Amino acid sequence: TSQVRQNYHQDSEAAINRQINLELYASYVYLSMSYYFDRDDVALKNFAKYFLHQSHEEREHAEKLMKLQNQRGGRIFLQDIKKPDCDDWESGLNAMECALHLEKNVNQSLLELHKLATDKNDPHLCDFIETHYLNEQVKAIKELGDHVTNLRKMGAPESGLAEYLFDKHTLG
Amino acid sequence: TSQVRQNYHQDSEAAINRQINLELYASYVYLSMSYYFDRDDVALKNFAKYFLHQSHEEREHAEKLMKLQNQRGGRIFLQDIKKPDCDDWESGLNAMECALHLEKNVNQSLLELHKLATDKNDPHLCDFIETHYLNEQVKAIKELGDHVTNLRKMGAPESGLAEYLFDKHTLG
Amino acid sequence: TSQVRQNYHQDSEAAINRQINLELYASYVYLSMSYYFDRDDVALKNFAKYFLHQSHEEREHAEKLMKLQNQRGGRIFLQDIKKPDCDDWESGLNAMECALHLEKNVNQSLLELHKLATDKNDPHLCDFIETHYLNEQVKAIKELGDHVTNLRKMGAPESGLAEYLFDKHTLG
Amino acid sequence: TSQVRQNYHQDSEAAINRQINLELYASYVYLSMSYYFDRDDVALKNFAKYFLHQSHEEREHAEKLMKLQNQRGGRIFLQDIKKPDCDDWESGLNAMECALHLEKNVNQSLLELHKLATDKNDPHLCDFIETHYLNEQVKAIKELGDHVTNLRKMGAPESGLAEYLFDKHTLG
Amino acid sequence: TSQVRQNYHQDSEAAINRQINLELYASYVYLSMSYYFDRDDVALKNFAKYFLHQSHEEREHAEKLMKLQNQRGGRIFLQDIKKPDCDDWESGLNAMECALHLEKNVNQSLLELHKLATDKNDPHLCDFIETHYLNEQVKAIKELGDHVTNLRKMGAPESGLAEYLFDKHTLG
Amino acid sequence: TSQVRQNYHQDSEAAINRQINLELYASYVYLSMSYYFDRDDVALKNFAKYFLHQSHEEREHAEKLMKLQNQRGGRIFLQDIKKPDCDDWESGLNAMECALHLEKNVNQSLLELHKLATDKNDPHLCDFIETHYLNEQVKAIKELGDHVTNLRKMGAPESGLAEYLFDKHTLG
Ligand code: NA
Ligand code: NA
Ligand code: NA
Ligand code: NA
Ligand code: NA
Ligand code: NA
Ligand code: NA
Ligand code: NA
Ligand code: NA
Ligand code: NA
Ligand code: NA
Ligand code: NA
Ligand code: NA
Ligand code: NA
Ligand code: NA
Ligand code: NA
Ligand code: NA
Ligand code: NA
Ligand SMILES: [Zn+2]
Ligand SMILES: [Zn+2]
Ligand SMILES: [Zn+2]
Ligand SMILES: [Zn+2]
Ligand SMILES: [Zn+2]
Ligand SMILES: [Zn+2]
Ligand SMILES: [Zn+2]
Ligand SMILES: [Zn+2]
Ligand SMILES: [Zn+2]
Ligand SMILES: [Zn+2]
Ligand SMILES: [Zn+2]
Ligand SMILES: [Zn+2]
Ligand SMILES: [Zn+2]
Ligand SMILES: [Zn+2]
Ligand SMILES: [Zn+2]
Ligand SMILES: [Zn+2]
Ligand SMILES: [Zn+2]
Ligand SMILES: [Zn+2]
Ligand SMILES: [Zn+2]
Ligand SMILES: [Zn+2]
Ligand SMILES: [Zn+2]
Ligand SMILES: [Zn+2]
Ligand SMILES: [Zn+2]
Ligand SMILES: [Zn+2]
Ligand SMILES: [Zn+2]
Ligand SMILES: [Zn+2]
Ligand SMILES: [Zn+2]
Ligand SMILES: [Zn+2]
Ligand SMILES: [Zn+2]
Ligand SMILES: [Zn+2]
Ligand SMILES: [Zn+2]
Ligand SMILES: [Zn+2]
Ligand SMILES: [Zn+2]
Ligand SMILES: [Zn+2]
Ligand SMILES: [Zn+2]
Ligand SMILES: [Zn+2]
Ligand SMILES: [Zn+2]
Ligand SMILES: [Zn+2]
Ligand SMILES: [Zn+2]
Ligand SMILES: [Zn+2]
Ligand SMILES: [Zn+2]
Ligand SMILES: [Zn+2]
Ligand SMILES: [Zn+2]
Ligand SMILES: [Zn+2]
Ligand SMILES: [Zn+2]
Ligand SMILES: [Zn+2]
Ligand SMILES: [Zn+2]
Ligand SMILES: [Zn+2]
Ligand SMILES: [Zn+2]
Ligand SMILES: [Zn+2]
Ligand SMILES: [Zn+2]
Ligand SMILES: [Zn+2]
Ligand SMILES: [Zn+2]
């Protein structure tokens, strides 16, 4: 037992390790998306920048979870970071839709984590999740939904002009 | 075939994808090391900072390789990032020794990549490797060797005082 | 023999004179393109600016090659600069495609020059080419490929609106 | 017919295309002279700088003529830029004498152009020539004549000391 | 074996030790030249300054080679620094000619070193030489050739006025 | 005889040439020591910096002696700079002890030089030595003695921790 451990359940520790892996996976997915939009036959630089920023933010989230694990006296156990489900993301709209789905999956995992923390009477972990993750997820999901709405209304993905102008005026 | 591709061999493209995976793996190893030194029962904050900086640098190297792949008209294919070989790195000296071994492995891969680029008459790729990777690897290996030498001479890992003072005076 | 000449093969000297002519020719092609887009019945000012900048850059490349020739003790022999293959470049997309083809031709000449320098064991010339020309060519080719991709996706050349908006938002 | 064309004779358009070629040729001659003085066995850096500046100025004159052609609704037709009559310019004094002869030839062409514009009742073209070319030519010819006079009086080309000191004190 | 040594051939290590000695020797030669021009019966202060600067630059080159030797895990073995071949350098022109010969000898040694590094498949050493030594040697040789040309054309060494004015206007 | 020579004995001139060689030799010894401490298996960066600074100071002393030789109308005659007696200096303490011995040898040579100048009634040379060398030697010897004392009291060379902490706190 760690000398700092107090009111930290082994189930919570395991769930935090799983969340660390999920955040690293999301970072990897966003990295793949960014460099898809960096291809010469796609060439949407602001889509690339947007998804690279998301990748770095997901890495920061994972590192905050590892810091939490150490603060509470749990032990970090890392697992393989699985490759993203796609090599080719097919369009700005498709990438935004996949990102929306990914963020909702991460949010579901965070909500299950909060439910576990509540069931284990761990208010510090509950507040950690609330303060650093839940509203960030809600804001990200709302922004991605807005982006999907606008791309669809402008006529993406069929309209390369739509994706070009969205890249310039919303993401630039 | 990509409209930008010129004098870029499929073997070189494959080798670059392998190097991308290796750099991401090295980033993951350094991340694990950093948060090992963040544990309450290790508590060497400057070891943690040193290895976190290395992790971020390895990520930047991987992203530079992906950018190169797109610049030359190759296609990025990502693979799983395997978990590090250790969860517990046992000491500052042991972590520095493992980092030295890892950097020499990465350097060997880069040298094989340069040999392939030379054999394929790809001077742009040769110079890319020389400019951005080879001397960085040599400098990193020399620095890690210096750190290992100093820790051993001060009496690590048996001397917790040795690791404490090295953390303060060399890494701080 | 020049008092400064050392390890400089006559074949390399001839190849450098040929490269000087090729760079001057590329400068002339870009000049023609720029002032095509300055016509009242074309009127794409940022296409004109882009190609004029390319023309001046090609002139600078030619002058750097002449400076190299003198540094190594070779002798500059200038030839006629042939007129560009077109007087009318037909569209922004067509001009970008022709520029991509031209840059790939120049890159091929530079790669043959590097192969000659390698065969003659002239590492100074090899590094001169690597440092000042090869990555510039790769970057130019990637940028032109990106431009061609975006123009095609926006609907050029049939879409005068596509070329207008590309002129404003990418080249402006 | 161009929508902007007004009071612009086809003879004037042809003469302007010829002048564009002549200015580009003069630029090329000055480029050759500059890098002759950059040779290790000539080594007069301020002669080299002087003639390189002249080369760039001639390019600017050519581009101003192309801009004029488009402003008036004429169409630019480029021709080969012939190589300079010399590879070796033999001395600072000889190069200055050749430059004087070249500038007087360009001035003669400009005066014939002005006579044509007057005969065609094209006051805009007349004033364009007067404003941007005629006094520039007179000033250049006077300066080159001054340089030739001083070099001859100092004892060039027989006096390498004369050319050295002129390079330092007049052109530096 | 050094813990940092990787892909570093014993032949390359020996060649680097020889190059260190050669650079120190060149530094000594330039020191001798500088203080020859500091003599009361020579009294060319800017020749003295020029050669002293060259001496210090050669020392810096030697120290960079020693740093490289340690970076790669080789071991420095110093040898005697032989005295320069002359005590009296006879004139500014003669000293410049001897310096040109010395720089071409150093360049030949560096080119042989690069050939050895290429034969041993040591791209880090190849790029080290290319980046830090080859173009510096080419530039130094071109500058010395220019100086020799100008001194000869001004009438050195017979013209003490020639050497005086060169000292003032080129080296001052 | 030099036109500036006055009250300058040939014995003094010879002794000054010998002192020039001795100072250059001391510079070389300190250079060797510095790069010994730059080795990956020694890795004491502030020892390396200290001895490199000493090497540069010894070079400056040698150049001041050559300047003196020319000021007095003597003639500089350079000799080989012998290699240092050691390639491996074994420890910070051993290097400091060798440096102390070297500085006392140089001081003895300077004192013999002053005795010669006194015997030859050369007060300018006497004061030159007093002003620029004697107290510098005394200060250097006292500082090296202090360093040796502290290293011995801290437990060097057996205590790698002693040398590490001395490197950090006294030489850093
Ligand atoms: Na767990
Ligand atoms: Na689990
Ligand atoms: Na915490
Ligand atoms: Na591949
Ligand atoms: Na592979
Ligand atoms: Na690239
Ligand atoms: Na030739
Ligand atoms: Na040819
Ligand atoms: Na050069
Ligand atoms: Na015409
Ligand atoms: Na005509
Ligand atoms: Na106009
Ligand atoms: Na050796
Ligand atoms: Na040897
Ligand atoms: Na190195
Ligand atoms: Na003597
Ligand atoms: Na003697
Ligand atoms: Na004096
Ligand atoms: Zn514990
Ligand atoms: Zn659980
Ligand atoms: Zn691409
Ligand atoms: Zn792109
Ligand atoms: Zn964009
Ligand atoms: Zn997240
Ligand atoms: Zn998988
Ligand atoms: Zn696709
Ligand atoms: Zn709350
Ligand atoms: Zn493609
Ligand atoms: Zn391969
Ligand atoms: Zn902990
Ligand atoms: Zn801690
Ligand atoms: Zn700390
Ligand atoms: Zn790396
Ligand atoms: Zn695994
Ligand atoms: Zn442990
Ligand atoms: Zn010549
Ligand atoms: Zn050839
Ligand atoms: Zn027009
Ligand atoms: Zn227009
Ligand atoms: Zn515009
Ligand atoms: Zn070019
Ligand atoms: Zn033609
Ligand atoms: Zn048209
Ligand atoms: Zn718009
Ligand atoms: Zn028209
Ligand atoms: Zn006409
Ligand atoms: Zn030359
Ligand atoms: Zn020159
Ligand atoms: Zn000059
Ligand atoms: Zn003109
Ligand atoms: Zn011709
Ligand atoms: Zn000539
Ligand atoms: Zn060793
Ligand atoms: Zn060898
Ligand atoms: Zn004197
Ligand atoms: Zn003097
Ligand atoms: Zn002077
Ligand atoms: Zn050198
Ligand atoms: Zn000797
Ligand atoms: Zn003499
Ligand atoms: Zn290179
Ligand atoms: Zn004068
Ligand atoms: Zn004398
Ligand atoms: Zn004596
Ligand atoms: Zn070493
Ligand atoms: Zn070291
Ligand atoms: Zn240190
Ligand atoms: Zn001294
Ligand atoms: Zn010896
Ligand atoms: Zn040792
Ligand atoms: Zn006194």
Numbering used by the authors:
A (entry chain D), B (entry chain F), C (entry chain T), D (entry chain E), E (entry chain A), F (entry chain S): 5 to 176
Question: What did the article's authors report about this structure?
Answer:
In addition, we also collected a second dataset using a Falcon 4 detector in the electron counting mode (MRC format, not EER format) with a throughput of ~500 movie stacks per hour, resulting in ~7700 movie stacks from a 15 h data collection.
Our results demonstrate that an atomic resolution structure can be obtained on a 300 kV Titan Krios G3i microscope using the K3 or Falcon 4 detectors with or without an energy filter, which thus gives users having this kind of instrumentation the possibility of performing single-particle cryo-EM analysis at the atomic resolution level.
